RNA sequence: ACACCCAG
């Protein structure tokens, strides 16, 4: 469970009870990374 | 201020000067003696 | 026949609405029997008169042998028996239509089948059928000597408004004032 | 006896009789006419109506309160 | 949502049938050739090749619905000629036409490329 | 045995387009060859796109849309490979498809143009035709596009990305000698490039015993198959469809005996 | 709730509007009734839950 | 947002011609001659390059 | 607008098209009730 | 106010955005110009009732 | 005393994008200005950052070939909405009748009018309450007692679906557990159909201080049958059929139009400016510059555009000889064909299609709910009950209003008539 | 309160008892489909797979319903529920074992809607009886409802994103009611005005005007491609009208095969001259305008909306009254299929060249407008000085307004007649007006010659400013340009003053559309709830709910309005 | 509840 910060774009490894808080730049907007399972896109 | 509108009602002899907000205005050119006051020197300045 | 229609129709508007199309099913009888209009026919004029009389008795709207019922039966199908006697007369059938004996028998049977099929079916909600048919062409006129005419007139006419908007008369002149502009 | 209503069969009696007959035959009622392979109960009921074999009596209610019992085989089929 | 797959216009999966022959009872010696998963590409040439046959009386094709992929070819012939033989001769003449057209095209490529 | 005898004359044969004339042929045969050019000629195009990471401003399945429209040359490969739906592998194999890998990361400050040269294919002779080049996505520094794609075999009926033809022009009887079209004012309409009429004249006279006999083609490819290979594969493709119909028809005639 | 298998919990099919048990597929009870508002008001504001329940 | 890979109407390749079209316009060419130099004869391909706006230039100004 | 005087004055910006955003930012709203069947201020 | 197009893009804000709208609870709210009858002016009407 | 700067400044914002507005009937100009607010395009350049609850973005927004001189000022050049379309006004096989559009399928497969549909699902946890506790967590069938027919497998351990995961109807994207006064399960679900791929997942702290989340679901909406398409002159219509490029008619140089509209849509509406735009577009696409469609430009009339078109080998009235796409025969009439700016409207058939066999009923009426958002039933209104009376169908009217809506039984006394 | 719950439109009585939300209904956007019959409707697969029809299991269909249960709710067509005889309902998406999947007699299987199913199709302003018509379901894979084009007129549905409801009957009694009372073929002729409410519209009507012309001829291959779409065809190719130079069939011969039975009808084309009925060529037509159909074969005449449209006594009306509902249904589909596929060959279009007039017509239009402007200026000069005598019944100002409007209306009519005089036969604006498919003669006049005088609230453009229509004019200007007359056309382009006056008549038409609809809907409501209980009883007396005689016979004759026609009485007009 | 909006 790792999040991408909206400003510095660095991983944060936030747990289930850790408040939303960037460990590097101090920013409160997080984005989840893309999932490891791969989705098939048809080219149509 | 340019937004102030002054209206002369000659057939009633009334002069109404309005200043308050809410009036709706649009710009127009000025014609005096059947000639535009917008000469060519204004267009060349506005073209730069 | 003529004197009754002069009372009913004073304006001479002969375009009326009737169930069986007499001028067309005669044309049907000419084509299905291959009737040649040039050759003389073999249809007895008294057979036409007895055929129309039998057909007129066979179309019933008000059923019953009571004199009150018979008077209502005669009045209900009055205008159709005007048209039936006019179109199926002996002179027109011997000169213009030139139907044969077998074609005339088919025509009488088909008129009876078509008239009995055009009778208003009991149970039909004609009240809701009428007002749908009278409010559907109320969306095809424009709103407002001027005169109220359209949706405001329809709104006024079915409300029975005790004060109108544009009340008017149509006064006609009886004597010499009609023919003379001075007395008018 | 003493029947004053229309001998012809109206469109509304054709709708209800065919509706009732199709519902009955779908509920394993005995079919009254031989069938050449029909399965839809609407088409079976139409075949029963054209053969004048529907076992239904139409009861028409006059406005005064009296009623007339008309059997479907006694009415002229409009179709 | 209701979008059909794009390959249903030219595949036959388990259940359909490429060509069926139904006899037409309206006139003698007529057949209704029903071809599945095709379009106007084959319907037009088959109708035209059957029309050039002087001993075939009727030849026409229709598509009942452009959203479906079925064509219907009705062939009516002379009473001494089976409609099924007319369809086979129409296909055989078209194959011999296209194979010769391909061979004549291949020659013209060689003649153009050599100078 | 009532098949007419067609002849071919070729006027222009370039790298991108071919001009040829077919004579002594019905209109329906010439029209069917034209629609086989668009819909029944198989080529190889990307159909299966799998995106591992896409940080571009273009979303994932819009990159996949632009990848499928990129034409891949299949001048001698499309005959060898069979369709993926008729193969023996469970999903995809090199015998019935080719694999494309894309891996572009932008570290320079300038905008990185992810073009078609960056599509690396395992098959040495199935490449993008431009390898300027077809633009896929523009990348700002810090944006990564990494994906792997598979390319199947298909024709234009399934999708427009499998269309080798890029503008076939079909024209017959440019002088309007058959009156198939009726000009209201014939003097206004410009003469066609294949017309053989004088300047003062504008429309050929009516031909009672006439049929459409001469056809003009301007088949142009967008890459993929060459101009001559499109027509040669089309006439084989229409022959294969007619041979398949004849086999099934003879089967059903034999069944109904 | 199910007659043949009372122990199994009932799954809800809001699209089909009925209570279905997931073993034998029998529909138990009656049609589901939405507890939300029918419009998108005839109800009032709720009592503030932290404020003590008065009138 | 970005130049289409194929022409919408006929299917000609126009995805490789957008960069050359901007280069010709920067070299003081009229838009009519710039399209004619790229090989677009039909007006369907001409409207693909002429009417296209490059929104990907404004999209790339924002940080990823 | 109070604290029953006016209602429906502030709207969520119609962020569907740039033409729609500009049209919504330059909108005039009349106080005539839409249940009134009068047509004198609508022409 | 008074920011260049490059500085607006760095702030993740569109330069083409005309503005003119409030942001309340994260929803963009626009004030529609309400129209009233003009004040301070004597009016004569034609009430036919 | 005063003079107008330009007379085309009397128009508004959405009416300024109409090419040749003076050649149209006025109800047509009003209808387009309504539809101009519904055209799909890139609505803002930072749409990849904003998380709007509705957001429609077109793939290939093109500037109009026939433009107005006010388009440089409304920034329609920079942020257009619509694609220039080769439009042939022909009466084809019959699917363009009554304001419909026959659309080239092979064009649509190449990116014609294909757009994404961004939808956002905000949700916040409410820590307030004397007993209730509301925590983002992946639900478990053993603990939660409020689930329904859906799959709780696409979630993560945090309670949020990850980006790049496909979703369908009745799918869970928020793991949302609230403690009972152990815990009951209420969560946000995808609406009916609405299949797509989760684009990005965003978590912050909102204004209330609680934990906030926002998921943007992205779905590609390929144009299909039923999508509403309108020109810039009020010529609205729906895509009647999708023919492939080999089936559409083609010009002798090989141009198959992308859109075919009815010839019968013109005369009762008199959208002559649509005809002028479709003929100016041929000149603009051939000569090379973007054409001028200023509303009151006296130096541009029909005869001047017609003379320019005659210099490029086309008919001076804009007609061309189209060949039939099926049989290859020449069409006897000469079809008027040229580039016309068309817009795709947000009114889409996948957002409107709705059906209901049997579903949830209201708490008060025990009748089907209102609208597709909650799987409701269509209203058999007073006007419909009225028409079934005139038909005479009594059992069908009874079936609609009693059997198929809310059947119920009550027990009634016989002395009084009160419910027992 | 309780009163607010029970009153008005959203109350309990009007909003929940007189009309209420129902199950087994669907709504989606409609699209055209001319390849269906008039009684067929296209249904999407997801709509048909979502909602079911309860079928009672009988030994006649025990095998078919067992197969539908085994398919389940995943492969269309299939079943969604098994309603048992004791009332238990078993859902088929949750039960894997076949222990309770066996069907016996008396069970109900809720199978999916399939082909041939009967539905009610309804357009949302349900004005008349022909808006709740019953169709047959045909599954066509896409996301829209499909209608034939001949049913668009009774619904008043264009295909511009209209959307219409689809109600599916549940019991077998209600299916039979819809099948014998409210199907599409049984509602062709309305009892409102005893004319066919349906007809031929737009592309099919324009091309049938072209297909029945005298100059159209079809080749050998074109006829047998056209005859493939004829459902009622005998199968025999008719003898060509031209044999020896080349086998050619006229267009009237192919339409003669379309016309069913042996019906007889005489109609007239829209362009029939008045003097042809009394001239020497009465029964032979130079313009080919006298439509006669004899023995079911078209002999002469060009068909239009006055022969194939909604007009009373037209060829469709004759077909319904002779053959029946089922044959007329095939008559509608065979017209639409044959004509459209010939329209693929002939083609039809509209363009700029269909609006351009020659230099002589533009000079004649400009001369008439200049003369009319000089006439109005003369009237104003005669009215400024006290020289105009007021007509009786009105004041001088209304006399002046009547005289100016008379001149300007005569100017529009004269420039209108000058514009359509110089329209060629190949002009496509004329091709869709004389056929009556769409548009009218005033629309061609507005496109080509002049827009005409534009009125707001009956009168001309009022003096909104102080005695001025616009600031660009002088005070007290009663001329045509200042008061709203548009001397330009749509093709030439309107001047900015004329454009603003055009936006006023256009707005006033839109204000009339919104106000009239809100009023007429209340007129319609009141008019019928007063008499909705009026019913023809079984003694053929029209009575209301409380059994009071309204009419002794319905319509004073006892005949329904469906089977009555317009006729002529031969013994009323002639003299003695 | 209100706004906006689709169709006639
Ligand atoms: Mg509409
Ligand atoms: Zn950070
Ligand atoms: Zn393989
Ligand atoms: Zn192109
Ligand atoms: Zn009691």
């Amino acid at each position: 469970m790792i999040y991408i910060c909206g400003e510095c774009h660095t991983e944060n490894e936030i747990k289930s009870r850790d408040p939303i808080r960037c460990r590097e730049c101090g920013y409160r907007i997080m984005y989840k990374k893309r999932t490891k399972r791969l989705v098939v896109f048809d080219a149509r | 201020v340019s937004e102030v509108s002054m209206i002369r009602d000659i057939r009633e002899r009334e002069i109404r000067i309005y200043t308050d907000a809410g009036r709706i205005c649009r710009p127009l050119l000025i014609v005096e003696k059947q000639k535009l006051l917008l000469k060519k020197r204004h267009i060349d300045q506005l073209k730069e | 026949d003529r004197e009754v229609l002069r009372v009913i129709f004073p304006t001479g508007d002969s375009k009326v609405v009737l169930p069986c199309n007499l001028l067309r099913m005669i044309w049907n009888a000419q084509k299905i029997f291959h009737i040649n209009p040039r050759l003389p026919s073999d249809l007895h004029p008294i057979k036409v008169v007895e055929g129309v009389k039998e057909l007129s008795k066979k179309l019933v709207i008000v059923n019953g042998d009571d004199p009150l019922s018979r008077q209502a039966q005669e009045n209900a199908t009055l205008l159709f028996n005007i048209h039936l006697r006019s179109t199926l007369c002996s002179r027109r059938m011997a000169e213009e239509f030139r139907l044969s004996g077998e074609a005339f028998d088919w025509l009488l049977g088909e008129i009876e089948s078509k008239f009995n099929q055009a009778i208003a079916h009991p149970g039909e909600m004609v009240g809701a059928l009428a007002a749908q048919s009278l409010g559907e062409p109320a969306t095809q006129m424009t709103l407002n000597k001027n005169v109220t005419l359209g949706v405001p007139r329809l709104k006024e006419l079915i409300n029975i408004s005790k004060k109108p908007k544009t009340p008017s008369l149509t006064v006609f002149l009886l004597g010499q004032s009609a023919r003379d502009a001075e007395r008018a | 006896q003493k029947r004053i209503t229309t001998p012809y069969m109206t469109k509304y009696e054709r709708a209800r009789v065919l509706g009732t007959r199709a519902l009955q035959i779908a509920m394993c009622a005995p079919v009254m006419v031989e069938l050449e392979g029909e399965t839809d109960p609407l088409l079976i009921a139409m075949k029963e109506l054209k053969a004048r074999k529907i076992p239904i009596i139409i009861r028409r209610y006059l406005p005064d309160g009296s009623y007339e019992d008309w059997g479907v085989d006694e009415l002229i089929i409009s179709d | 949502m209701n979008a059909p797959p794009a390959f249903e216009s030219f595949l036959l999966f388990e259940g359909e049938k490429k060509i069926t022959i139904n006899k037409d009872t309206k006139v003698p010696n007529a057949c209704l050739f029903t071809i599945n998963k095709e379009d106007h590409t084959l319907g037009n040439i088959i109708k035209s090749q059957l029309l050039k046959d002087p001993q075939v009386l009727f030849a026409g094709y229709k598509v009942p619905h452009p959203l479906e992929h079925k064509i219907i070819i009705r062939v009516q012939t002379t009473p001494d000629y089976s409609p099924q033989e007319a369809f086979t001769n129409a296909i055989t003449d078209l194959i011999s036409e296209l194979s010769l057209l391909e061979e004549r095209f291949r020659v013209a490529i060689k003649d153009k490329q050599e100078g | 045995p009532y098949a007419n005898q067609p002849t071919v004359r070729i006027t222009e044969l370039t790298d991108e387009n071919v001009k040829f004339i077919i004579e002594n042929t019905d209109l329906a045969v010439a029209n069917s060859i034209r629609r086989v050019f668009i819909a029944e000629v198989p080529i190889i195009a990307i159909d299966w796109v799998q995106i591992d990471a896409n940080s571009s401003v273009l979303h994932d399945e819009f990159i996949a849309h632009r990848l499928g429209l990129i034409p891949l040359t299949s001048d001698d490969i499309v005959d060898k490979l069979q369709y993926s739906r008729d193969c023996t592998c469970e999903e995809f194999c090199p015998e019935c498809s080719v694999e494309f890998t894309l891996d572009v990361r932008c570290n320079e400050d300038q905008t990185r143009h992810v073009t078609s040269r960056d599509l690396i294919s395992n098959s040495p002779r199935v490449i993008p035709v431009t390898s300027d080049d077809i633009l896929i996505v523009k990348l700002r520094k810090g944006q990564e596009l990494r994906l792997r794609a598979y390319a199947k075999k298909g024709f234009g009926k399934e999708h427009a990305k499998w269309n080798p033809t890029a503008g076939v022009a079909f024209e017959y009887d440019p002088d309007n000698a058959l009156r198939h079209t009726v000009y209201p004012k014939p003097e206004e309409w410009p003469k066609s490039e294949y017309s053989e009429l004088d300047e003062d004249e504008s429309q050929a006279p009516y031909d009672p015993n006439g049929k459409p006999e001469r056809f003009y083609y301007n088949v142009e490819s967008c890459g993929s198959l060459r101009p001559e290979t499109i027509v040669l594969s089309a006439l084989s493709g229409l022959k294969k469809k007619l041979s398949d119909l004849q086999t099934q028809l003879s089967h059903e005639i034999q069944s109904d005996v | 709730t199910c007659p043949n298998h009372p122990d199994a919990i009932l799954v809800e099919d809001y699209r089909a509007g009925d209570m279905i048990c997931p073993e034998c597929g029998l529909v138990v009870g009656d049609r589901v009734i939405d507890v939300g508002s029918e419009w998108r008001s005839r109800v009032g504001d709720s009592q503030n839950p932290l404020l003590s329940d008065g009138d | 947002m970005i130049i289409p890979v194929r022409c919408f109407t006929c299917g000609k390749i126009v995805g490789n011609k957008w960069e050359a079209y901007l280069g010709l316009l920067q070299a003081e060419y009229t838009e009519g001659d710039a399209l004619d130099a790229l090989g677009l004869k039909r007006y369907c391909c001409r409207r693909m390059l002429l009417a296209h706006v490059d929104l990907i230039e404004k999209l790339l100004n924002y940080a990823p | 607008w109070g604290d029953q005087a006016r209602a429906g004055v502030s709207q969520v910006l119609n962020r569907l098209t740039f033409a729609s955003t500009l049209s919504h930012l330059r909108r005039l709203n009349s106080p005539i009730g839409r249940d009134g069947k009068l047509a004198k201020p609508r022409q | 106010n008074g920011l260049t197009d490059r500085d607006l893009c760095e702030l993740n804000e569109c330069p083409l955005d005309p503005g003119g709208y409030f942001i309340i609870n994260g929803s963009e709210k626009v004030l529609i110009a309400q129209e009233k009858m003009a004040t301070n002016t004597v009016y004569v009407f034609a009430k036919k009732d | 005393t005063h003079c107008e700067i330009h007379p085309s400044m009397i128009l508004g914002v959405c009416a300024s994008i109409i090419p040749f507005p003076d050649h149209n009937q006025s109800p047509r100009n009003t209808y387009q200005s309504a539809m101009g607010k519904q055209a799909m395009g890139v609505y803002i350049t930072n749409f990849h950052v904003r998380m709007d609850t509705l957001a429609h973005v077109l793939y290939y927004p093109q500037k109009p070939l026939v433009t107005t001189r006010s388009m440089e000022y409304l920034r329609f050049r920079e942020l257009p909405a619509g694609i220039n379309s080769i439009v042939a006004i022909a009466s084809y096989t019959g699917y363009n009748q009554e304001d419909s559009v026959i659309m080239n399928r092979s064009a649509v497969d190449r990116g014609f009018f294909r757009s994404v549909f961004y939808r956002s699902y905000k949700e916040q946890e409410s820590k307030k309450g004397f007993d209730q506790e509301e925590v983002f967590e992946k639900p478990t069938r053993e603990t939660c007692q409020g689930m329904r027919h859906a799959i709780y497998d696409k979630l993560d351990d945090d309670g949020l679906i990850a980006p790049g995961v496909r979703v369908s109807g009745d799918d869970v994207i928020i793991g949302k557990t609230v403690t009972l006064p152990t815990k009951r399960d209420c969560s946000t679900f995808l609406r009916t159909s609405e299949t797509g791929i989760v684009d990005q997942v965003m978590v912050t702290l909102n204004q209330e201080g609680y934990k906030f989340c926002k998921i943007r679901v992205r779905s590609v909406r390929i144009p299909q049958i039923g999508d509403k398409f309108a020109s810039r002159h009020g010529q609205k219509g729906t895509c009647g059929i999708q023919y492939r490029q080999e089936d559409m008619p083609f010009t002798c140089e090989g141009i198959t139009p992308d859109i075919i509209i009815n010839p019968h849509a013109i005369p009762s509406r008199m959208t002559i400016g649509h005809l002028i735009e479709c003929l100016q577009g041929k000149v603009s696409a051939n000569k090379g510059e973007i054409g001028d469609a200023t509303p009151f430009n006296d130096a541009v009339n029909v005869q001047k555009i017609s003379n320019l078109l005659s210099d490029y080998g086309y008919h001076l009235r804009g007609n061309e000889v189209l060949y039939n796409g099926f049989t290859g025969r020449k069409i006897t009439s000469q079809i008027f064909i040229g580039p016309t700016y068309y817009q795709r409207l947000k009114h889409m058939v996948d957002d409107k299609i709705h059906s209901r066999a049997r579903g949830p009923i209201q708490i008060l009426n025990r009748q089907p709910m209102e609208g597709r958002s909650r799987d409701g039933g269509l209203r058999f209104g007073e006007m419909e009950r009225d028409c079934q009376i005139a038909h005479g169908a009594a059992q069908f009217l009874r079936e609609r209003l009693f059997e198929a809506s809310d059947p119920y039984q009550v027990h009634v006394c016989n002395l009084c008539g009160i419910m027992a | 309160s309780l009163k607010q719950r029970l009153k008005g439109k959203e109350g309990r009585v009007r909003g929940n008892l007189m009309g209420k939300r129902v199950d087994f209904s669907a709504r989606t956007v409609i699209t055209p489909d001319p390849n269906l019959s008039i009684d067929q409707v296209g249904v999407p697969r997801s709509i048909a797979a979502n909602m079911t029809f309860a079928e009672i299991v009988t030994p006649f269909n025990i095998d078919r319903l067992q197969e539908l249960v085994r398919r389940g709710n995943s492969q269309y067509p299939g079943a969604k529920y098994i309603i048992r005889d004791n009332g238990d309902r078993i859902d088929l998406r949750f039960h894997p074992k076949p222990s309770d999947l066996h069907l016996q007699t008396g069970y109900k299987v809720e199978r999916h809607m399939c082909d041939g199913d009967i539905v009610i199709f309804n357009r949302q302003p349900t004005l008349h009886k022909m808006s709740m018509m019953g169709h047959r379901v045909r599954i066509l894979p896409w996301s829209t409802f499909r209608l034939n084009l001949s049913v668009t007129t009774p619904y008043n549905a264009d295909f511009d994103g209209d959307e219409m409801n689809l109600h599916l009957p549940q019991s077998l009694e209600t299916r039979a009611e819809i099948q014998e009372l409210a199907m599409v073929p049984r509602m062709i002729v309305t009892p409102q005005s005893n004319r066919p409410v349906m007809g031929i519209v737009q592309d099919t009507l324009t091309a049938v005007r072209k297909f029945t012309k005298r100059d159209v001829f079809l080749e050998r291959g074109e006829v047998m491609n056209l005859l493939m779409f004829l459902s009622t065809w005998d199968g025999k190719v008719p003898q060509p009208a031209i044999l020896k130079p080349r086998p050619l069939w006229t267009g009237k011969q192919i339409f003669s095969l379309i016309i069913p039975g042996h019906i007889n009808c005489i109609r007239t084309h829209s362009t029939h001259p008045d003097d042809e009925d009394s001239g020497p060529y009465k029964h032979i037509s130079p313009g080919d305008t006298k439509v006669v159909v004899e023995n079911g074969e078209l002999i002469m005449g060009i068909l239009c909306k006055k022969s194939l449209g909604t007009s009373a006594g037209s060829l469709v009306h004759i077909s319904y009254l002779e053959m029946g509902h089922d044959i007329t249904r095939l008559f509608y589909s065979n017209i639409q299929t044959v004509i459209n596929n010939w329209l693929l060959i002939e083609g039809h279009t509209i363009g700029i060249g269909d609006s351009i007039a020659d230099s002589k017509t533009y000079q004649d239009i400009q001369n008439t407008i200049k003369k009319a402007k000089q006439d109005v200026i003369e009237v104003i000069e005669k009215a400024h000085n006290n020289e105009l005598e007021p007509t009786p019944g009105n004041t001088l100002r209304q006399t002046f307004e009547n005289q100016v409007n008379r001149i300007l209306n005569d100017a529009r009519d004269k420039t209108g007649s000058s514009a359509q005089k110089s329209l060629s036969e190949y002009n496509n604006f004329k091709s869709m007006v004389v056929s009556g498919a769409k548009g009218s003669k005033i629309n061609i006049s507005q496109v080509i010659a002049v827009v005409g005088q534009q009125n707001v609230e009956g009168k001309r453009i009022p003096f909104g400013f102080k005695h001025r229509t616009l600031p660009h004019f002088i005070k007290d200007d009663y001329g045509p340009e200042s008061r709203g007359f548009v001397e330009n056309s749509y093709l030439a382009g309107l001047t900015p003053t004329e454009f603003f006056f055009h936006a006023m008549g256009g707005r006033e038409g839109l204000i009339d559309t919104a106000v009239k609809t809100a009023e007429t809907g209340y007129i319609q409501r009141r008019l019928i709830k007063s008499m909705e209980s009026v019913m023809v009883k079984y003694d053929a007396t029209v009575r209301n709910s409380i059994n009071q005689v309204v009419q002794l016979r319905y319509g004073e004759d006892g005949l329904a309005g469906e089977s009555v026609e317009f006729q002529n009485l031969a013994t009323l007009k002639p003299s003695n």
Side-chain angles (χ1 to χ4, degrees), chain K residues 190-338:
Chain K
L190 267 293
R191 323 287 194 80
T192 79
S193 80
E194 297 267 1
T195 179
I197 296 99
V198 171
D199 210 331
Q200 67 180 358
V201 175
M202 191 275 258
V203 296
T204 61
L205 294 174
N206 70 20
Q207 199 209 351
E208 316 297 325
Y210 294 130
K211 182 176 178 180
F212 194 50
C213 68
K214 253 173 177 159
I215 288 144
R216 199 168 48 171
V217 167
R218 166 197 75 220
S219 68
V220 162
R221 292 284 158 89
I222 315 174
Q224 56 181 354
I225 294 195
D227 285 289
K228 193 190 180 97
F229 285 83
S231 177
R232 264 183 314 162
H233 312 264
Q235 291 277 359
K236 48 181 64 172
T238 54
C239 175
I241 195 53
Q242 274 182 344
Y243 282 131
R244 280 174 300 271
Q245 200 207 338
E246 81 255 29
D247 283 353
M248 302 276 315
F250 56 95
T251 303
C252 77
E253 42 177 352
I255 296 168
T256 80
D258 306 331
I259 279 170
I260 299 187
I261 60 174
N262 215 346
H264 284 82
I266 304 299
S268 170
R269 294 171 176 86
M270 305 151 302
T271 61
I272 311 298
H274 183 269
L275 304 168
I276 298 185
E277 177 189 1
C278 192
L279 190 149
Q280 173 70 45
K282 292 177 77 172
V283 185
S284 296
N286 284 282
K287 191 154 181 181
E289 71 295 19
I290 298 303
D292 194 349
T294 300
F296 309 112
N297 196 314
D298 67 340
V300 170
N301 50 2
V302 178
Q303 200 64 45
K304 275 173 185 340
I305 315 167
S306 278
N307 281 347
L308 287 174
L309 192 44
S310 162
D311 289 351
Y312 291 123
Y314 301 111
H315 187 241
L316 60 86
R317 296 295 168 216
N319 298 97
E320 288 180 353
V321 182
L322 289 192
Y323 296 75
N324 201 315
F326 302 118
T327 72
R329 204 191 167 276
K330 297 179 140 181
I331 289 170
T332 308
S333 296
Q334 292 89 359
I335 308 315
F336 172 76
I337 179 172

Side-chain angles (χ1 to χ4, degrees), chain F residues 166, chain H residues 7-12 14 42-46 48, chain K residues 255:
Chain H
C7 180
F8 291 155
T9 311
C10 68
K12 205 204 190 294
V14 296
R42 287 173 304 273
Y43 57 90
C44 61
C45 309
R46 292 169 83 87
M48 202 68 30
Chain K
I255 296 168

Side-chain angles (χ1 to χ4, degrees), chain C residues 63 112 116-117 119 121-125, chain D residues 3-6 8-12 78:
Chain C
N63 189 21
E112 181 181 1
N116 268 337
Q117 213 184 320
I119 278 168
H121 299 259
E124 175 147 315
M125 322 287 298
Chain D
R3 301 222 273 261
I4 78 164
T5 54
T6 79
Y8 291 97
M9 180 167 165
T10 67
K11 58 176 73 174
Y12 314 109
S78 83

Side-chain angles (χ1 to χ4, degrees), chain L residues 46-59:
Chain L
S46 70
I47 284 179
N50 212 324
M51 66 161 184
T52 81
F53 175 77
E55 205 155 6
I56 296 99
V57 175
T58 190

